[PDB]
């Protein structure tokens, strides 16, 4: 809805409205984990949900990077032989 952590709320709870644009470059994972580490008033279950969000988005980056490597595999194999 609103906030830097709103995308993580969508990932933890909705997960359907997420698109590839947010997945690729919207935030740095290592940044946001150190954002969430020292926060005050942090309830246990909401921390668990933020862990859901970060785990989900990290694994989605791994799947999309695997994908990227796949079309890399297609583009490297081409060659031109006039014979």
């Amino acid at each position: 809805k609103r906030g830097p952590l709103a995308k993580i709320w969508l990932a933890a709870h909705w997960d359907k409205k997420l698109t590839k644009a947010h997945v690729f470059e919207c935030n740095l994972e290592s940044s946001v984990e150190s954002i969430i580490s020292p926060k005050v008033k942090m309830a246990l279950r909401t921390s668990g949900h933020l862990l859901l969000g970060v785990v989900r988005i990290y694994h989605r980056k791994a799947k999309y990077l695997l994908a990227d490597c796949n079309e890399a595999f297609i583009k490297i194999k081409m060659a031109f032989r006039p014979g």
């Binding site: 590839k20 994908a67 583009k75 081409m78 031109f80 006039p82």
Partner: protein, 477 residues
Amino acid sequence: MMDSSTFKRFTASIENILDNLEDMLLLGKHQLNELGSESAKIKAMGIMDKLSTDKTVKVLNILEKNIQDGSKLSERLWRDLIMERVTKSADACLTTINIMTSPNMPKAVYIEDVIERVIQYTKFHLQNTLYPQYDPVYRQRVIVMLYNKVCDIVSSLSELLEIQLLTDTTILQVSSMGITPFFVENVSELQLCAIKLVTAVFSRYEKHRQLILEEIFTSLARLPTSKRSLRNFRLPMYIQMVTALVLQLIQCVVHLPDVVITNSYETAMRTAQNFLSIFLKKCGSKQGEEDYRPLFENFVQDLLSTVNKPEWPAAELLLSLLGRLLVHQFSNKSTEMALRVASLDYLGTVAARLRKDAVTSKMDEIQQLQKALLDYLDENTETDPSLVFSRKFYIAQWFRDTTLETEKKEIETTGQIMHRAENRKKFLRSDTVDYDDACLIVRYLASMRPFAQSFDIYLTQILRVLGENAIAVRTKA
């Protein structure tokens, strides 16, 4: 005019004062701008009877000019920047005009280095400048005039490449640019010029068919997919661009000089069937994160939307090959689910609107009709170029029609021999008919060929798939 040496000496004075003041390092904008402006038509007949080594030294000089902004890698310095590209673009215009200028062009008044240089200039500066601000996905009159110069230079590049053979180390990247702008928005006239370029490279060389189809299938996902200005090719009835690109690849290869006609024409259907087979097999399965289906539906409605116009043939051949592929695939059980349901859906669409076209269309005589239509399209080629390829495709089509008539008596042998003689006479030969009459006579010719008379047969194929072992497919059938 046999000489018209009344501004021939004007231009000749221009280059001799230029190479005097430069040879004994830039020549500035205005002089070269007017030089290209007069080079448009004044030397287009008068370039002959000019000193050859002076041509070599001036193309070397303007080569050294275009070296400067060749891969240039680029509030007040921007004025220098824009004037640099406009100056070198005018220089590019002079190169691409000067080389093509004579109808007969003597060998080695050129070196491929300068054509390579204008090519790489085109590559870098086009991809740097014109795509990002005419397509925000990749992201005042100077841009517009630069655009028009790009259009003119690539058109002249196309006809120059048709004039003479070039090396493959040019062919690969000129084909790359000929296909490049077909996935951005506001480039329609550039796309016509790119059609001209791909006619030149495709009909001129038979060794890059595989190449062209592979770069076609690579970046199909980059299509705009926008409701605004998707169909912008007049024939109302505007059509999408890459469909007409495919069509002119289909009709572009003839290789008109005996059995050369037959083998080249079956080569044409083979190249087409490889194209559509690979395109279909890439489309049929659902790939990750994207799809090629909507490409296939819009492509095929455009294909049958341009089914029967006398200057767009072979769409009937596409539809016959479509019927053959669909009966080959969906009858089995081994093929994947999405391909079968796709082919059944396109079969339903073509059958329905073909049926309504059939019920809404109709409601030496053959030689007379053939000669009248060929005269009318000869007029059209005298008016509109590049349709000579369609004419030669038609000649091959009638040759193979008489062939399939021959193998399916002696009076029919005499008749087909007379038709063969007429065809060869019109080969050696290589009124007041209208476009509407041309459409009527070409749909009459299509009615003569056993093509539209198989519709119920296709329904029969549906009858062969009425009983199935899988429910979903026959439900939506």
